């Protein structure tokens, strides 16, 4: 009476349209607001900060509201998903819709990215809580989480492959300026964005229908725990631990560097590298390398340990990020640095999860009383990885506004391209170095004590 392969596949497929919307927004929303929606970069900085930041805020609030949801006739998590999908797809479509408003398109966009965050939060937080309701066996939950991770990585690949190849199919004319001194339309680019958003909304629905039909919740009613934002002593207990903190701050700074790269690499490809037509192929090559490098780093964490894996995995992108701003925009250099950056992306977003069970065993050895420490650690990481990435994207687009970013443009001035070189070469390398210095101060020292902590797992 365990989970079938079809139920785990439906639960896995239900988590993909999300990654798809995350990759589409995080790679293309800045260039949509700057070049397609024709907004002021101050307003684009406001929108890109407030959508992520407010998003992070709603995550524990929707977690608290979901944790008090009573048992209905359809389940505890399925009513939220089913009743929040058709509003989330409408808000997602109206994110990439350019309205005919005489004043205040910033208010239109602010409403959606943020409302979408609320709605998607209402789709994803019950979806993340559904792992405790699909089955009572821990091996079944681990297999369902492995299926969910595989389909999350595949939807990460698909989300830059549908939006990128659709909105890059129909280009738009560019706007010359005084620095430039001495048939496709802008409406076709907006129609391509609407077509890509309609395809992603169709995927969302289809996967929501698949998740509703293929997943049951079994009516367990045999466990009880706390809620997000109801108590905060557990967060202080997690932050009081040494390795737990070190891990969350390192993974934070590293994810902050790579989220800054994800936000501001489309504009670096369009303007600094001169790839206004073929930036989506560079993003697709990065995502293909990040998909194909995951078994490589899975083999590498067993072959050569995990200390050198996180020492060289997150820092392999450093000479390539130097080289992309130290060459005069070569195509082959761009593609080989795209492959290296995909390998480093796979390392930096895979190997902390390999580090995590050693820290879990060390925390179980340190504290015999443990309940929900992993969930509150992941919630703390998520919020910050969201709030501080919103701060970073707002600071980036505000620096573009200060430097004089011409919308579209065909050539940026030397002040804007210097800010792009800093935002893809100086600041992410600085954040990676800070995260590596936090990873140096690591008293667990990989398995060399943690296996002894596993002996403590044999003790208790």
């Amino acid at each position: 009476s365990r989970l079938s392969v079809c139920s785990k596949l439906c639960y896995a497929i239900g988590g993909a349209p999300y990654q798809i919307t995350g990759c589409a927004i995080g790679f293309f929303l800045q260039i949509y607001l700057l070049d397609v929606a024709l907004l002021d970069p101050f307003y684009a900085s406001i929108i890109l900060f407030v959508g992520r930041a407010w998003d992070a805020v709603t995550d524990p609030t929707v977690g608290f509201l979901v944790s008090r949801t009573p048992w209905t006739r359809f389940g505890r998590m399925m009513p939220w998903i089913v009743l929040s999908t058709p509003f989330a797809v409408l808000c997602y479509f109206l994110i990439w819709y350019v309205p005919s408003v005489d004043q205040g398109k910033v208010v239109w966009y602010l409403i959606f990215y943020c409302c979408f965050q609320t709605l998607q939060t209402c789709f994803h937080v019950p979806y993340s809580a559904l792992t405790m309701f699909i089955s009572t066996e821990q091996k079944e939950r681990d297999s369902a989480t492995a299926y969910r991770m595989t389909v999350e990585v595949l939807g990460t690949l698909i989300g830059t492959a549908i939006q990128g190849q659709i909105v890059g199919m129909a280009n738009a004319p560019c706007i010359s300026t005084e620095i430039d001194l001495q048939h496709v339309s802008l409406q076709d680019l907006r129609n391509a964005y609407m077509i890509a958003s309609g395809v992603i909304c169709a995927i969302y629905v289809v996967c929501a229908v698949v998740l509703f039909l293929g997943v049951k919740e079994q009516k367990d009613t045999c466990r009880v725990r706390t809620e997000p934002m109801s108590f905060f002593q557990g967060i202080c207990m997690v932050m009081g631990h040494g390795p737990y903190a070190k891990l969350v701050m390192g993974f934070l700074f590293t994810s902050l560097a790579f989220m800054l790269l994800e936000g501001n690499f489309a504009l670096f490809c369009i303007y600094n590298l001169g790839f206004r037509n073929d930036f989506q192929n560079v993003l697709l090559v990065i995502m293909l390398s990040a998909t194909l490098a995951i078994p490589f780093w899975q083999w590498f964490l067993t072959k050569f340990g995990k200390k050198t894996a996180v020492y060289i995995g997150t820092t392999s992108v450093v000479p390539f990020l130097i080289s992309v701003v130290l060459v005069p925009s070569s195509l082959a250099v761009t593609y080989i640095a795209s492959f290296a950056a995909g390998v480093s992306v796979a390392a930096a977003f895979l190997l902390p999860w390999s580090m995590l069970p050693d820290v879990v065993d060390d925390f179980k050895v340190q504290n015999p009383e443990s309940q929900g420490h992993e969930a509150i650690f992941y919630s703390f990481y998520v919020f910050f990885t969201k709030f501080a990435s919103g701060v970073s994207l707002g600071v980036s687009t505000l620096s573009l506004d200060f430097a004089g970013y011409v919308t579209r443009g065909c050539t940026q001035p030397g002040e804007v391209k210097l800010t792009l070189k800093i935002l893809v070469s100086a600041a992410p390398i600085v954040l990676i170095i800070i995260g590596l210095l936090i990873f140096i101060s690591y008293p667990i020292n990989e398995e060399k004590r943690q296996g002894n902590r596993k002996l403590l797992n044999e003790q208790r």
């Binding site: 706007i175 005084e178 001194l181 001495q182 506004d401 004089g404 011409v406």
Partner: protein
């Protein structure tokens, strides 16, 4: 707020060189392209743009005629006009929004590239002798090189026509539709000491 203050109107003499200043307030001048326009009697033209911490970009019609300079130690942008003769226009210095290409703030300073300086002549043009209802009286101001001001003693029916160039001087006319005619005079005020008022007689 953000504003741009220029110099006064200038009168270069034939083939001089005229420097028009534009002092900015309310924004860093080294971040924005400060522009320089040209409004004739017809429409608006576009001489050039100047980045105060970098390059100057001209229109091909104004290369060699215009020379834009930027003093960033005095938040000032200047346009130097070389050879003239038909550059009698109004020059604006409205800077550009750094993202779009349009001009939020603006300017305005006249340039009148002519020669001569003379006192106007006033002629009381009147009716030939016919009369039907209201009478139409006139006042012709001919031969000056400034801006005049024509007036009538408390009568509001006057049409003072815009002045025109004939040779190197200006010509202007004024008309009054007055019903009764006890006495009417025409007053002309001028920048120079030429405040001559002439009565309008019959025949």
């Amino acid at each position: 707020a953000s504003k741009l203050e220029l110099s006064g109107p200038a009168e270069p003499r034939g083939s001089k060189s005229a420097q028009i200043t534009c002092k900015a307030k309310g924004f860093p001048e080294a971040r924005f392209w400060v522009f320089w326009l040209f409004q004739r009697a017809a429409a608006l033209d576009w001489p050039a743009a100047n980045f105060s911490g970098g390059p100057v970009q001209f229109e091909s019609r104004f290369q060699g005629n215009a020379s834009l300079k930027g003093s960033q130690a005095q938040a000032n942008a200047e346009l130097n006009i070389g050879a003239l003769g038909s550059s009698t226009a109004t020059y604006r210095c409205g800077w550009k929004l750094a993202n779009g290409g349009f001009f939020p703030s603006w300017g305005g300073a006249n340039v009148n590239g002519a020669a001569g300086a003379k006192a106007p002549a006033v002629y009381p043009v009147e009716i030939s002798g016919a009369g039907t209802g209201s009478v139409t009286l006139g006042c012709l101001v001919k031969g000056y090189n400034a801006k005049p001001n024509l007036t009538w003693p408390g009568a509001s029916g006057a049409l003072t026509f815009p002045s025109e160039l004939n040779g190197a001087l200006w010509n202007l006319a004024s008309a009054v539709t007055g019903s009764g005619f006890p006495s009417a005079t025409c007053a002309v005020g001028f920048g120079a000491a030429t405040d001559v008022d002439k009565k309008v007689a019959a025949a």
